[PDB]
Design a protein around this ligand. Structure first.
Ligand SMILES: [Mg+2]
Ligand SMILES: [Mg+2]
Ligand SMILES: [Mg+2]
Ligand SMILES: [Mg+2]
Ligand SMILES: [Mg+2]
Ligand SMILES: [Mg+2]
Ligand SMILES: [Mg+2]
Ligand SMILES: [Mg+2]
Ligand SMILES: [Mg+2]
Ligand SMILES: [Mg+2]
Ligand SMILES: [Mg+2]
Ligand SMILES: [Mg+2]
Ligand SMILES: [Mg+2]
Ligand SMILES: [Mg+2]
Ligand SMILES: [Mg+2]
Ligand SMILES: [Mg+2]
Ligand SMILES: [Mg+2]
Ligand SMILES: [Mg+2]
Ligand SMILES: [Mg+2]
Ligand SMILES: [Mg+2]
Ligand SMILES: [Mg+2]
Ligand SMILES: [Mg+2]
Ligand SMILES: [Mg+2]
Ligand SMILES: [Mg+2]
Ligand SMILES: [Mg+2]
Ligand SMILES: [Mg+2]
Ligand SMILES: [Mg+2]
Ligand SMILES: [Mg+2]
Ligand SMILES: [Mg+2]
Ligand SMILES: [Mg+2]
Ligand SMILES: [Mg+2]
Ligand SMILES: [Mg+2]
Ligand SMILES: [Mg+2]
Ligand SMILES: [Mg+2]
Ligand SMILES: [Mg+2]
Ligand SMILES: [Mg+2]
Ligand SMILES: [Mg+2]
Ligand SMILES: [Mg+2]
Ligand SMILES: [Mg+2]
Ligand SMILES: [Mg+2]
Ligand SMILES: [Mg+2]
Ligand SMILES: [Mg+2]
Ligand SMILES: [Mg+2]
Ligand SMILES: [Mg+2]
Ligand SMILES: [Mg+2]
Ligand SMILES: [Mg+2]
Ligand SMILES: [Mg+2]
Ligand SMILES: [Mg+2]
Ligand SMILES: [Mg+2]
Ligand SMILES: [Mg+2]
Ligand SMILES: [Mg+2]
Ligand SMILES: [Mg+2]
Ligand SMILES: [Mg+2]
Ligand SMILES: [Mg+2]
Ligand SMILES: [Mg+2]
Ligand SMILES: [Mg+2]
Ligand SMILES: [Mg+2]
Ligand SMILES: [Mg+2]
Ligand SMILES: [Mg+2]
Ligand SMILES: [Mg+2]
Ligand SMILES: [Mg+2]
Ligand SMILES: [Mg+2]
Ligand SMILES: [Mg+2]
Ligand SMILES: [Mg+2]
Ligand SMILES: [Mg+2]
Ligand SMILES: [Mg+2]
Ligand SMILES: [Mg+2]
Ligand SMILES: [Mg+2]
Ligand SMILES: [Mg+2]
Ligand SMILES: [Mg+2]
Ligand SMILES: [Mg+2]
Ligand SMILES: [Mg+2]
Ligand SMILES: [Mg+2]
Ligand SMILES: [Mg+2]
Ligand SMILES: [Mg+2]
Ligand SMILES: [Mg+2]
Ligand SMILES: [Mg+2]
Ligand SMILES: [Mg+2]
Ligand SMILES: [Mg+2]
Ligand SMILES: [Mg+2]
Ligand SMILES: [Mg+2]
Ligand SMILES: [Mg+2]
Ligand SMILES: [Mg+2]
Ligand SMILES: [Mg+2]
Ligand SMILES: [Mg+2]
Ligand SMILES: [Mg+2]
Ligand SMILES: [Mg+2]
Ligand SMILES: [Mg+2]
Ligand SMILES: [Mg+2]
Ligand SMILES: [Mg+2]
Ligand SMILES: [Mg+2]
Ligand SMILES: [Mg+2]
Ligand SMILES: [Mg+2]
Ligand SMILES: [Mg+2]
Ligand SMILES: [Mg+2]
Ligand SMILES: [Mg+2]
Ligand SMILES: [Mg+2]
Ligand SMILES: [Mg+2]
Ligand SMILES: [Mg+2]
Ligand SMILES: [Mg+2]
Ligand SMILES: [Mg+2]
Ligand SMILES: [Mg+2]
Ligand SMILES: [Mg+2]
Ligand SMILES: [Mg+2]
Ligand SMILES: [Mg+2]
Ligand SMILES: [Mg+2]
Ligand SMILES: [Mg+2]
Ligand SMILES: [Mg+2]
Ligand SMILES: [Mg+2]
Ligand SMILES: [Mg+2]
Ligand SMILES: [Mg+2]
Ligand SMILES: [Mg+2]
Ligand SMILES: [Mg+2]
Ligand SMILES: [Mg+2]
Ligand SMILES: [Mg+2]
Ligand SMILES: [Mg+2]
Ligand SMILES: [Mg+2]
Ligand SMILES: [Mg+2]
Ligand SMILES: [Mg+2]
Ligand SMILES: [Mg+2]
Ligand SMILES: [Mg+2]
Ligand SMILES: [Mg+2]
Ligand SMILES: [Mg+2]
Ligand SMILES: [Mg+2]
Ligand SMILES: [Mg+2]
Ligand SMILES: [Mg+2]
Ligand SMILES: [Mg+2]
Ligand SMILES: [Mg+2]
Ligand SMILES: [Mg+2]
Ligand SMILES: [Mg+2]
Ligand SMILES: [Mg+2]
Ligand SMILES: [Mg+2]
Ligand SMILES: [Mg+2]
Ligand SMILES: [Mg+2]
Ligand SMILES: [Mg+2]
Ligand SMILES: [Mg+2]
Ligand SMILES: [Mg+2]
Ligand SMILES: [Mg+2]
Ligand SMILES: [Mg+2]
Ligand SMILES: [Mg+2]
Ligand SMILES: [Mg+2]
Ligand SMILES: [Mg+2]
Ligand SMILES: [Mg+2]
Ligand SMILES: [Mg+2]
Ligand SMILES: [Mg+2]
Ligand SMILES: [Mg+2]
Ligand SMILES: [Mg+2]
Ligand SMILES: [Mg+2]
Ligand SMILES: [Mg+2]
Ligand SMILES: [Mg+2]
Ligand SMILES: [Mg+2]
Ligand SMILES: [Mg+2]
Ligand SMILES: [Mg+2]
Ligand SMILES: [Mg+2]
Ligand SMILES: [Mg+2]
Ligand SMILES: [Mg+2]
Ligand SMILES: [Mg+2]
Ligand SMILES: [Mg+2]
Ligand SMILES: [Mg+2]
Ligand SMILES: [Mg+2]
Ligand SMILES: [Mg+2]
Ligand SMILES: [Mg+2]
Ligand SMILES: [Mg+2]
Ligand SMILES: [Mg+2]
Ligand SMILES: [Mg+2]
Ligand SMILES: [Mg+2]
Ligand SMILES: [Mg+2]
Ligand SMILES: [Mg+2]
Ligand SMILES: [Mg+2]
Ligand SMILES: [Mg+2]
Ligand SMILES: [Mg+2]
Ligand SMILES: [Mg+2]
Ligand SMILES: [Mg+2]
Ligand SMILES: [Mg+2]
Ligand SMILES: [Mg+2]
Ligand SMILES: [Mg+2]
Ligand SMILES: [Mg+2]
Ligand SMILES: [Mg+2]
Ligand SMILES: [Mg+2]
Ligand SMILES: [Mg+2]
Ligand SMILES: [Mg+2]
Ligand SMILES: [Mg+2]
Ligand SMILES: [Mg+2]
Ligand SMILES: [Mg+2]
Ligand SMILES: [Mg+2]
Ligand SMILES: [Mg+2]
Ligand SMILES: [Mg+2]
Ligand SMILES: [Mg+2]
Ligand SMILES: [Mg+2]
Ligand SMILES: [Mg+2]
Ligand SMILES: [Mg+2]
Ligand SMILES: [Mg+2]
Ligand SMILES: [Mg+2]
Ligand SMILES: [Mg+2]
Ligand SMILES: [Mg+2]
Ligand SMILES: [Mg+2]
Ligand SMILES: [Mg+2]
Ligand SMILES: [Mg+2]
Ligand SMILES: [Mg+2]
Ligand SMILES: [Mg+2]
Ligand SMILES: [Mg+2]
Ligand SMILES: [Mg+2]
Ligand SMILES: [Mg+2]
Ligand SMILES: [Mg+2]
Ligand SMILES: [Mg+2]
Ligand SMILES: [Mg+2]
Ligand SMILES: [Mg+2]
Ligand SMILES: [Mg+2]
Ligand SMILES: [Mg+2]
Ligand SMILES: [Mg+2]
Ligand SMILES: [Mg+2]
Lengths: 137, 52, 204, 117, 122
RNA sequence: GGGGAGGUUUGGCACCUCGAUGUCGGCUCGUCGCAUCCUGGGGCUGAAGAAGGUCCCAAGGGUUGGGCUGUUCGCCCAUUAAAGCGGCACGCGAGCUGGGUUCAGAACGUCGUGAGACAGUUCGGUCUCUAUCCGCCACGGGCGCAGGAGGCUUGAGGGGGGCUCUUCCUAGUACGAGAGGACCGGAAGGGACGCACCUCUGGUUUCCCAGCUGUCCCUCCAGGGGCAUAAGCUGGGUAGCCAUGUGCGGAAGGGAUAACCGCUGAAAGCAUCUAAGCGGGAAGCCCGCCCCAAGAUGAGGCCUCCCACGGCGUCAAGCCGGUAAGGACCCGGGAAGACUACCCGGUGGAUGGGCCGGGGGUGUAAGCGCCGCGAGGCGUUGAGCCGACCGGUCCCAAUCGUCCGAGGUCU
RNA sequence: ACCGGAGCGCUGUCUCGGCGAGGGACCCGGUGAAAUUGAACUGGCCGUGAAGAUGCGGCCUACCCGUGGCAGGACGAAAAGA
RNA sequence: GUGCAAGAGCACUCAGGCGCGCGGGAGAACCCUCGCCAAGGAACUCUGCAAGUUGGCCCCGUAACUUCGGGAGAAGGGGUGC
RNA sequence: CAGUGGAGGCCCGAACCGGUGGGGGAUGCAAACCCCUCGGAUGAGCUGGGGCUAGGAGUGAAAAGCUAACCGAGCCCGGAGA
RNA sequence: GGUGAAAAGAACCCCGGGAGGGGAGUGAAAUAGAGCCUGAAACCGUGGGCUUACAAGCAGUCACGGCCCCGCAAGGGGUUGU
């Protein structure tokens, strides 16, 4: 009994593992399963991650973007059965945990305020190609 | 004064009755092991002391 | 009519097919039946389930005399489940197949001495145009010379919370016998670690 | 009902913080200190932190502890004497024993605080 | 969540730029309206010689909100503004081409026409 | 033309109150009436159907948001199942407001020689911290419950809840020339309200982290502290408490009935629902659901535990000390709490504090190296710091002890 | 800093309330008032009575004493009605 | 004294003087004073009462009307640190 | 027209003089106070000291305002035991 | 306004920081002990008797009963259960 959490934590097996690490201040592209009419598709969604609300399992993250003149944000359960995959697209300088502030900034300022984390990229592409070697041979 | 005020002098009966729960109770005491005197449990007291 | 004692372990949410579901986890540990109410001896029918392992320390009480006549490991708690007589042994989560619905009972969180606005969810006066000393007050409480008194059970501020609260028709979302666990539809009275009894619903 | 949380106080924040400090200074200056019970039970944990933080040695720790006790000579005594004494120990660097005398003219109960030994 | 006295962006060439909510046509006394909810409203301003004139009392349906819509799949979604599409009394949209995204709740509600002309459902 | 009921209007009378019973409207909180606005059940219809009309039964719940005016009232906008009418000092100012009325200022029209005056108008104009008793909401102390104690309970008697729409299948079927369009039965989705909850969404989170200005100080640099609230400002923020968020409720069903519809059926050879007798029939009644509840002085029931006197009272019941089961004190505490109460723990112990780990928050600390003239930048680095949450560990603190507590009446 | 109408900006004025801070309230120790007060052993309903009853009648209800709260009554207090 | 356009303003601080002659705890309702708040933005109300919004200096720019002075800080913008 | 010049019951704003709106206070810190807000601030300005005018009399940018904490006729003593 | 005939106004010892007491002492009397003759009532307190925690009240009166106390007795006093 003296593990009230670990018990409630046992129900965690609905947990993912495939998904790649990413943190606010860099843009991604989730592929969500959706019910159109009655069937099932795979709608993409690509924008900057503005918030990650950590809480072990059932942690969440929210991405925003501009669709046809209007802004739009979506909240995704991190370990959701509907996220087929989540291709990251570009890393960038955080400097802050929650970046709501870009809401009032959607313009040239964003691009210049969130440069590009050459560090988290230099490790991305490095351990990408450099790690491809070990698996192939 | 302003607005409410007693409608009648309280009787010496009712008065003392109210006070039925005012009485005190003696302090809880125990004979301290070291000395002979009394101490309030869980406390150190003069003319005595403690072990380490 | 089933029955079983447990603790509110906490709650989170799991996914049923392509839909998320909020669930409260209840540990309905194995309950050693302790006595039996019968029409002949007691005047009614029921079963006194025990629950949770007691150290023979606090059992200094002649409770041991009750546990002896049943040959049971001393428990920390025990309440009856009315009109439910299981075979002589022990009840467990096994009686709850998923999709069944249950009536859960628990002692709500204690909101202490609560104002009328929190307790009875009154309206209270204006934050603004005058008054400024009755913002959270209940205002009038009566009439005039007639009836010239206040109604019995009038809504007024006071202690509120930490009372016997029974929710109903909660869905048994799952059941993990390997852990005496029991998943529900989330909203169950009381705080975590709180004792809580789960019964069969009265929908049907 | 507030309090479902966990902490205690009187006075306002900047004062209460100043209180814990000015006590822990005297306490790390006299080794024995007498205050009111509640003030003591609270001071208790505040010191077991600088003391343990004192078991570590790096200048970062020193600089951290300076933020509370302003006196440099005092942090010396803490690092170069008080701390070593508590090597090979893990917590409970401090002790609180309630006295049997109340304060007169306000009837407040007292208790002793001391660097353990 | 839209309620009377609220302003809405008009997402179609009906001529109207902005309309204010008059009444949310859910229950007999509903507090608020949301995506896929219809509302009576006043045209608080419109473009010259539009089908709808400034001052008309129109019906419209919420296509976007600022308060995130919570979906059963555990996700949610919110837009930068509150928007609507003026509709015919038989509930078909009055204007044609509708601009900007839309919540798919519009679909389950029976606004096929509008999700169609929508340049992007989300 | 005629007879009544009611006591919401306007009056009549002048009966309590002029050593004072504060007047309208609004707000808050309601509760009651039924002469019913809606929903439920019926009769008739000039009821094809859908929809109405009229009367009957029925308070159980419901009875929206705005524009104008101090308004009540009323008009209007947009909805609705409906936007019911009255009582309660036209309910409620020791609950609030004070726009209106109803003091002194001032002005208009009007009257008056005048001072002034107006159910005429206009702008302004001090609303009193402390509840004794009854009542009401909560929470304890005492004693009782004819042995004492631990735990579990029965439910007399109360209380809460009680609403309604919409689309779809039945079926474009019965009905109708057409337009339109059912009963009965079944399904889905809502509005408002109520209870509980923090997973999610979304708030607060007063020192959890970070950044920034001015100044003063430590210690010159660097680093850091105070004050700029009772957080100096700002960007974020766990637990807890919360709704905008999540779950669940209104029932089902049983029983007796209202209007009403009937069977059998006389009195009264026919006829009659009725006089004997019986069946059906409401959102209403009684149960059922949830909550309180044996001070139910009619003080209940079950399981279990401890039992003789140890001294005076011969008669009467008691009375005084030591103890049994068991309880209390004191201490560490708590999603329990104003206090008390309630609950857990007290060295055979993880109750609090510290330390450790995890969760979580902030978002690369200090120091050093490197690049730049420099403000800075880069690396070491998801670093450093790090409340409340989930656990672990006897380092510190619950040390030692004290007090009360049956001897069980009689027929 | 006159009085009326409208609009933009902004907002807890409001839908509709929630959380947080501090000073009181609450508990302990010290000091310790006031208006008021015929006397009190001071319940509910329906009547009744000088026409609005804790005190009369009938009936219902109710173990003794307090503490924190609410303001319907005591035709509450105050001021020999302006 | 330092800073801010200036100043006897504001913030911190010299010299100097004080913590206001009841304290201790608790962390209910409720009152006062203060901070914040999803969506909405006057729907509040007799009345935007209240509170918020705006705020300093520099630069661009500024309408009807006018008694030619005004209206003007109109309005609306941009800059501000190292 | 430029320059110089520095006028004003001019402008912003402390001291200072006020008392606009709201809140608190109501046996008050206070027999008129506290907080936020607001008005004037070279003038019909504010202010220290020395003086004069008073009871049907004074003074009054006029409210019957003020004339020692209540002025449609001050206070005290007397007529007076009206 | 008042000790007492007279200060004979309480040496000395004891508890106490003091105040104030307890003894000793003076006096006819100290409950005449110093704002001290007499010392009423309201009001506060200590002890004793009767009485009260299912009870409805202008508080009393009438009756009976119980307990306690006075007198050998018939009797009387206090209290109060119905
Ligand atoms: Mg665990
Ligand atoms: Mg737990
Ligand atoms: Mg409010
Ligand atoms: Mg007022
Ligand atoms: Mg007031
Ligand atoms: Mg009455
Ligand atoms: Mg009454
Ligand atoms: Mg937990
Ligand atoms: Mg805690
Ligand atoms: Mg501060
Ligand atoms: Mg710590
Ligand atoms: Mg007649
Ligand atoms: Mg009448
Ligand atoms: Mg009349
Ligand atoms: Mg009369
Ligand atoms: Mg007459
Ligand atoms: Mg009177
Ligand atoms: Mg009166
Ligand atoms: Mg009135
Ligand atoms: Mg009124
Ligand atoms: Mg009908
Ligand atoms: Mg029909
Ligand atoms: Mg027809
Ligand atoms: Mg016809
Ligand atoms: Mg027809
Ligand atoms: Mg039909
Ligand atoms: Mg009839
Ligand atoms: Mg009727
Ligand atoms: Mg209306
Ligand atoms: Mg209409
Ligand atoms: Mg309708
Ligand atoms: Mg209609
Ligand atoms: Mg209607
Ligand atoms: Mg009527
Ligand atoms: Mg009414
Ligand atoms: Mg009235
Ligand atoms: Mg009337
Ligand atoms: Mg009235
Ligand atoms: Mg009032
Ligand atoms: Mg009123
Ligand atoms: Mg009053
Ligand atoms: Mg006013
Ligand atoms: Mg009004
Ligand atoms: Mg007016
Ligand atoms: Mg008037
Ligand atoms: Mg008058
Ligand atoms: Mg006048
Ligand atoms: Mg008139
Ligand atoms: Mg007026
Ligand atoms: Mg007041
Ligand atoms: Mg009374
Ligand atoms: Mg009463
Ligand atoms: Mg019952
Ligand atoms: Mg009932
Ligand atoms: Mg009922
Ligand atoms: Mg009801
Ligand atoms: Mg059909
Ligand atoms: Mg069809
Ligand atoms: Mg079909
Ligand atoms: Mg046919
Ligand atoms: Mg026809
Ligand atoms: Mg036909
Ligand atoms: Mg045909
Ligand atoms: Mg046909
Ligand atoms: Mg034909
Ligand atoms: Mg047809
Ligand atoms: Mg058709
Ligand atoms: Mg929850
Ligand atoms: Mg939080
Ligand atoms: Mg800190
Ligand atoms: Mg944090
Ligand atoms: Mg430096
Ligand atoms: Mg600094
Ligand atoms: Mg300060
Ligand atoms: Mg500020
Ligand atoms: Mg500030
Ligand atoms: Mg700071
Ligand atoms: Mg902050
Ligand atoms: Mg039924
Ligand atoms: Mg049944
Ligand atoms: Mg009937
Ligand atoms: Mg027949
Ligand atoms: Mg019959
Ligand atoms: Mg019959
Ligand atoms: Mg039947
Ligand atoms: Mg029924
Ligand atoms: Mg129903
Ligand atoms: Mg029955
Ligand atoms: Mg029955
Ligand atoms: Mg209970
Ligand atoms: Mg119960
Ligand atoms: Mg009992
Ligand atoms: Mg019971
Ligand atoms: Mg019993
Ligand atoms: Mg038994
Ligand atoms: Mg024996
Ligand atoms: Mg024997
Ligand atoms: Mg112990
Ligand atoms: Mg052990
Ligand atoms: Mg521990
Ligand atoms: Mg621990
Ligand atoms: Mg950690
Ligand atoms: Mg983390
Ligand atoms: Mg770095
Ligand atoms: Mg290097
Ligand atoms: Mg270099
Ligand atoms: Mg260099
Ligand atoms: Mg790592
Ligand atoms: Mg903290
Ligand atoms: Mg560990
Ligand atoms: Mg004993
Ligand atoms: Mg004994
Ligand atoms: Mg006995
Ligand atoms: Mg003016
Ligand atoms: Mg506006
Ligand atoms: Mg804001
Ligand atoms: Mg309101
Ligand atoms: Mg507080
Ligand atoms: Mg006070
Ligand atoms: Mg104070
Ligand atoms: Mg006190
Ligand atoms: Mg009573
Ligand atoms: Mg009657
Ligand atoms: Mg009478
Ligand atoms: Mg009489
Ligand atoms: Mg009376
Ligand atoms: Mg009589
Ligand atoms: Mg009576
Ligand atoms: Mg009663
Ligand atoms: Mg008290
Ligand atoms: Mg109170
Ligand atoms: Mg009252
Ligand atoms: Mg009050
Ligand atoms: Mg009254
Ligand atoms: Mg008079
Ligand atoms: Mg500056
Ligand atoms: Mg400046
Ligand atoms: Mg500058
Ligand atoms: Mg001085
Ligand atoms: Mg003071
Ligand atoms: Mg002092
Ligand atoms: Mg702030
Ligand atoms: Mg703000
Ligand atoms: Mg807001
Ligand atoms: Mg905001
Ligand atoms: Mg916002
Ligand atoms: Mg706006
Ligand atoms: Mg308005
Ligand atoms: Mg309104
Ligand atoms: Mg209004
Ligand atoms: Mg108006
Ligand atoms: Mg304002
Ligand atoms: Mg405000
Ligand atoms: Mg503010
Ligand atoms: Mg601002
Ligand atoms: Mg600016
Ligand atoms: Mg600003
Ligand atoms: Mg001019
Ligand atoms: Mg400007
Ligand atoms: Mg202008
Ligand atoms: Mg401007
Ligand atoms: Mg600007
Ligand atoms: Mg800088
Ligand atoms: Mg020129
Ligand atoms: Mg020049
Ligand atoms: Mg000049
Ligand atoms: Mg010049
Ligand atoms: Mg001037
Ligand atoms: Mg001016
Ligand atoms: Mg002046
Ligand atoms: Mg003013
Ligand atoms: Mg003022
Ligand atoms: Mg004014
Ligand atoms: Mg006021
Ligand atoms: Mg005022
Ligand atoms: Mg006041
Ligand atoms: Mg005061
Ligand atoms: Mg202002
Ligand atoms: Mg000024
Ligand atoms: Mg000025
Ligand atoms: Mg002068
Ligand atoms: Mg002079
Ligand atoms: Mg002179
Ligand atoms: Mg005169
Ligand atoms: Mg003058
Ligand atoms: Mg005088
Ligand atoms: Mg005169
Ligand atoms: Mg005289
Ligand atoms: Mg006379
Ligand atoms: Mg004469
Ligand atoms: Mg003498
Ligand atoms: Mg002596
Ligand atoms: Mg001395
Ligand atoms: Mg002496
Ligand atoms: Mg003597
Ligand atoms: Mg003698
Ligand atoms: Mg004699
Ligand atoms: Mg003598
Ligand atoms: Mg004598
Ligand atoms: Mg004498
Ligand atoms: Mg004397
Ligand atoms: Mg005397
Ligand atoms: Mg004599
Ligand atoms: Mg006497
Ligand atoms: Mg006595
Ligand atoms: Mg007795
Ligand atoms: Mg009695
Ligand atoms: Mg009676
Ligand atoms: Mg005796
Ligand atoms: Mg005798
Ligand atoms: Mg008697």
């Amino acid at each position: 009994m003296n593990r009230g959490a670990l018990i409630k934590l046992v129900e965690s097996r609905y947990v993912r593992t495939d998904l790649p690490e990413f943190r606010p201040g860099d843009t991604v592209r989730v592929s969500y399963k959706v019910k159109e009419g009655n069937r099932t598709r795979i709608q993409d969604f690509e924008g900057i991650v503005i918030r990650i609300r950590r809480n072990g399992f059932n942690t969440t993250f929210t991405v925003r973007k501009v669709s046809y003149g209007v802004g739009v944000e979506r909240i995704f359960p991190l370990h959701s059965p509907l996220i087929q995959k989540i291709d990251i697209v570009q890393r960038g300088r955080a400097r802050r945990a929650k970046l709501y502030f870009i809401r009032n900034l959607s313009d040239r300022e964003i691009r210049r305020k969130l440069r590009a984390d050459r560090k988290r990229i230099d490790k991305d592409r490095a351990a990408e190609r450099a790690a491809k070697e070990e698996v192939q041979k | 004064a302003k607005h409410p005020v007693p409608k009648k002098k309280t009787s010496k009966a009712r008065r003392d009755a109210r006070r039925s729960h005012h009485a005190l109770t003696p302090p809880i005491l125990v004979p301290c092991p070291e000395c002979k005197a009394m101490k309030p449990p869980h406390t150190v007291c003069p003319e005595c002391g403690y072990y380490a | 009519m089933k029955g079983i004692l447990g603790v509110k372990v906490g709650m989170t949410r799991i996914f049923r097919d392509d839909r998320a579901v909020p669930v409260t986890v209840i540990l309905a540990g194995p309950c050693p039946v302790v006595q039996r109410r019968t029409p002949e001896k007691d005047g009614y029918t029921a079963v006194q389930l025990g629950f949770l392992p007691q150290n023979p320390k606090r059992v200094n009480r002649p409770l041991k005399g009750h546990f002896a006549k049943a040959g049971v490991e001393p428990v920390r708690i025990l309440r009856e489940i009315r009109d439910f007589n299981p075979e002589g042994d022990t009840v467990t989560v096994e009686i709850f197949k998923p999709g069944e619905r249950v009536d859960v009972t628990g002692t709500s969180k204690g909101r202490g001495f609560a104002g009328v606005m929190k307790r009875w969810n009154f309206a209270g006066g204006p934050d603004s145009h005058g008054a400024h000393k009755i913002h959270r007050h209940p205002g009038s409480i009566g009439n005039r010379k007639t009836p010239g008194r206040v109604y019995k059970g009038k809504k007024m501020a006071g202690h509120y919370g930490a009372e016997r609260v029974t929710v109903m028709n909660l869905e048994v979302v799952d059941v993990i016998p390997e852990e005496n666990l029991l998943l529900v539809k989330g909203a169950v009275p009381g705080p975590n670690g709180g004792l809580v009894i789960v019964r069969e619903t009265k929908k049907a | 009902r507030h309090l479902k949380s966990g902490r205690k106080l009187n006075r306002h924040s900047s004062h209460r913080l100043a209180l814990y400090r000015n006590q822990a200074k005297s306490l790390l200056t006299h080794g024995r200190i007498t205050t009111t019970v509640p003030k003591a039970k609270e001071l208790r944990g505040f010191v077991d932190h600088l003391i343990h933080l004192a078991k570590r040695g790096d200048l970062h720790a020193r600089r951290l502890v300076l933020r509370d006790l302003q006196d440099v000579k005092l942090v010396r005594k803490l690092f170069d004497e008080i701390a070593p004494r508590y090597r090979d120990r893990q917590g409970g660097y401090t002790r609180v024993l309630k006295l049997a005398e109340r304060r007169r003219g306000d009837g407040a109960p007292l208790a002793l605080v001391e660097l353990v030994e | 969540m839209i309620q009377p006295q609220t302003y809405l962006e008009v997402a179609d060439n009906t001529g109207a730029r902005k309309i204010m909510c008059i009444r949310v046509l859910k229950g007999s006394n509903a507090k608020y309206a949301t995506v896929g909810d219809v509302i009576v409203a006043s045209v608080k301003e419109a473009i010259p010689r539009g089908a709808v004139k400034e001052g008309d009392v129109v019906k419209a349906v919420v296509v976007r909100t600022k308060k995130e819509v919570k979906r059963p799949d555990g996700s949610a979604i919110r837009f930068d503004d509150n928007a609507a599409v003026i509709i015919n009394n038989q509930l078909e949209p009055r204007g044609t081409r509708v601009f900007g995204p839309v919540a798919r709740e519009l679909r389950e509600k029976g606004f096929m026409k509008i999700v169609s002309l929508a340049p992007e459902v989300l």
